[PDB]
Design a protein around this ligand. Structure first.
Ligand SMILES: Cc1ncc(COP(=O)(O)O)c(CN[C@@H](CCCC(=O)O)C(=O)O)c1O
Ligand SMILES: Cc1ncc(COP(=O)(O)O)c(CN[C@@H](CCCC(=O)O)C(=O)O)c1O
Lengths: 392, 392
């Protein structure tokens, strides 16, 4: 009997709705506002092809061979220069999703408290839940985490770490403002707490400039407790699975040793390809990806303003890939999903973004994948489904 | 500070000596008998370059995008055809190292019994150790595990699974014979036990044919309890990080959900590239791989027979990448390691292959990486170092 054969871990293991939706959304005719999949037109497939061939011809014996866990050295150096750290502080990971898995392994045990936002990224919840922690949450909004709520929790609990996405939070799109970051840093430093800062959407700001990361603020202050996660997924290629973690040597060593057991190393070809593509013109590329997402966000907001009844509330992003919607408390996002799917529109129901449940009346919308036309038509269909279900 | 902050997992995390040795061995000038790194001239650099470039040009929107966790469909289909199963029974993983991580997560909890050989593959020990299990061991030799010893364990203990490498075991090189495979299957079936069969070296047999796998024997008998692992690492490219697990649907689903949290999915370019490289001429490539390793094995044995004193014992492989050496109780492998390295020769001391300690007089030699001359020359230095150490 498999249920009898499985360990406790298997009982905590549940499928990710984002992961499962991809099987639906990659089918033709589906208008996807579901997974945060980058606009296909942004993939530099032609340039990647030329670079991959060159790597394999000129350096194939390196690209194809086992390599040390820490990563391709020129890639680590590039990340170090970009982030403002030294190459030896950088671990290359197989997507930031891997860094989440690793931090879970290093910090969490059965019953151990961990703190994140409600809602937060379901892939983090999933990775952490494997360890059987006790989730503590504080509400998150358009302005980031409720720091009065956080203050209350920290008087009562000592979380193993705080998992936060200060820049264009998944799924709310929230941007934690600078005074709030500084306040958070103080709260963390006073208690000597660990922060896991997920900066997946770092470069996808729509305004004039990005805000300093918690990690930059900690480094300025000389606080070693921020583990910084970044990824090439949203800026170049999610499919390559190449990302990085930066951390104090002791924490970094454990992440390294956990990674050895997880996959040995991130594939070398992929690391080398990322470095070849980005070593020249990265700033110019980042400007283009910001422009593309800004335009899609603008189209999305215009369509929502037009099509959605004004009893329904939704966030207005200043960056990233997501709009977060809240239905009159009573209306089910899962019910809404069924109706929208009949009209070939997919979104992510909000429930699974809440680590302790609730949020059955919320949903996440991604404007990353569709063109202007698809966004307007998808939202039109959504509005109609919304109006129908509000009536009943 | 960090030690206080870490969870119980951090204390069970230690570095792999194989993984650490690569930092040393990849440097020019060192003759490596350490990590089982495939012969570089076996890498199809030019064909890979053409295939990677074509994949990215024609299918970049797929290769560079997020993809479902289960894997690239034509690859699952290829594997299924090769192994003799259906596509739906295959999970593509990020090297078989990931499969080991995943089976640990699905089956083991703090204090849960796991059974493996003494010695066994250190990457499996390291992956499993994370979960806090109790390692139960049985001795392994040239003919595989001690089945009388296994019987005695099984009367008293119910392991969450048995981890075995019946074909060219790491590190002993042992081949579990067919009668022993059939006996093992009977013990497993009588007690309804789960087996994790790691077949990394499946195709690297030196004789006229391979033995039926425990998975194949199980399937013939209609027993669903063997989880079968394979890899493209030893037959194509380890650096690509592409492997597979085949299992009963309930087991496979939990492995899938655990993988979602581990890395989302194995990189897509890599899977498509493996498929493109192997879709024609796989049998012919396999025959060539077998010839190359047989030759290196022959060279290794020729040189050991001639350079090594007769007090020292070593296995004679019928396949795979390894020779396992036992020093006459009184010699330290760590001491021999110090001496050999002064001579630019690296191997893996045997201790870390023993999950519960021991084996300080043992070491593993790999003939995979060096050519015939390098093997001859490395072994003569090793032999000279050994004799010197034997003298005192
Ligand atoms: C805050 C945050 N951190 C980590 C990740 C994982 O991305 P990588 O592993 O770095 O590609 C993500 C993934 N974001 C998208 C992409 C997931 C798409 C998928 O799993 O199919 C989403 O939530 O839809 C994230 O939002
Ligand atoms: C029985 C067995 N199972 C799984 C693995 C992991 O290989 P993949 O992740 O499939 O590349 C291995 C890897 N074997 C080699 C290669 C590891 C090289 C390295 O970690 O640098 C060794 O033990 O030296 C293995 O022997």
């Amino acid at each position: 009997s498999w249920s009898e054969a499985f360990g406790k871990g298997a009982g905590r293991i549940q499928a990710s709705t984002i992961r499962e939706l991809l099987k639906l959304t990659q089918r033709p005719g589906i208008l996807s506002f579901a997974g945060g999949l980058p606009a296909p037109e942004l993939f530099p497939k032609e340039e990647a092809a030329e670079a991959a061939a060159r790597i394999l011809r000129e350096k194939g014996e390196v690209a194809l061979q086992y390599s040390p866990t820490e990563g391709y050295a020129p890639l680590r150096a590039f990340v170090a220069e970009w982030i403002g750290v030294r190459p030896e502080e950088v671990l290359i990971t197989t997507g930031s999703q891997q860094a989440l898995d690793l931090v879970g392994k290093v910090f969490l045990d059965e019953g151990s408290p961990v703190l994140l936002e409600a809602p937060s990224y379901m892939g983090a919840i999933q990775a952490f839940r494997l360890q059987g922690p006790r989730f503590l949450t504080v509400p998150a909004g358009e302005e980031g985490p409720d720091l009065d709520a956080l203050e209350e929790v920290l008087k009562r609990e000592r979380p193993r770490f705080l998992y936060l996405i200060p820049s264009f939070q998944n799924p709310t799109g929230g941007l934690t403002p600078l005074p709030a970051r500084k306040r958070l840093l103080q709260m963390v430093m006073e208690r000597g707490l660990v922060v896991v800062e997920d900066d997946a959407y770092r470069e996808l700001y729509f305004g004039e400039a990005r805000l300093p990361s918690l990690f930059e603020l900690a480094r300025e202050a000389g606080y070693p407790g921020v583990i910084y996660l970044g990824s090439f997924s949203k800026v170049l290629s999610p499919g390559l699975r190449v990302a990085f973690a930066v951390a104090h040597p002791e924490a970094l060593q454990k992440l390294v040793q956990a990674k050895q057991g997880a996959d040995l190393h991130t594939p070398m070809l992929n690391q080398m390809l990322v470095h070849e593509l980005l070593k020249e013109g990265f700033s110019e590329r980042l400007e283009r990806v910001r422009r593309v997402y800004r335009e899609k966000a603008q189209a999305m907001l215009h369509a929502l303003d037009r099509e959605v009844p004004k009893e329904v509330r939704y966030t207005r992003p200043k960056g990233g890939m997501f709009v977060w919607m809240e239905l009159p408390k009573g209306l089910s996002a899962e019910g809404l999903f069924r109706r929208a799917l009949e009209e070939n529109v997919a979104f992510v129901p909000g429930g699974p973004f809440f680590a302790n449940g609730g949020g059955e009346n919320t949903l996440r919308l991604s404007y990353a994948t569709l063109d202007r036309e698809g966004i307007a038509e998808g939202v039109r269909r959504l509005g109609r489904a919304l109006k129908g279900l509000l009536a009943l």
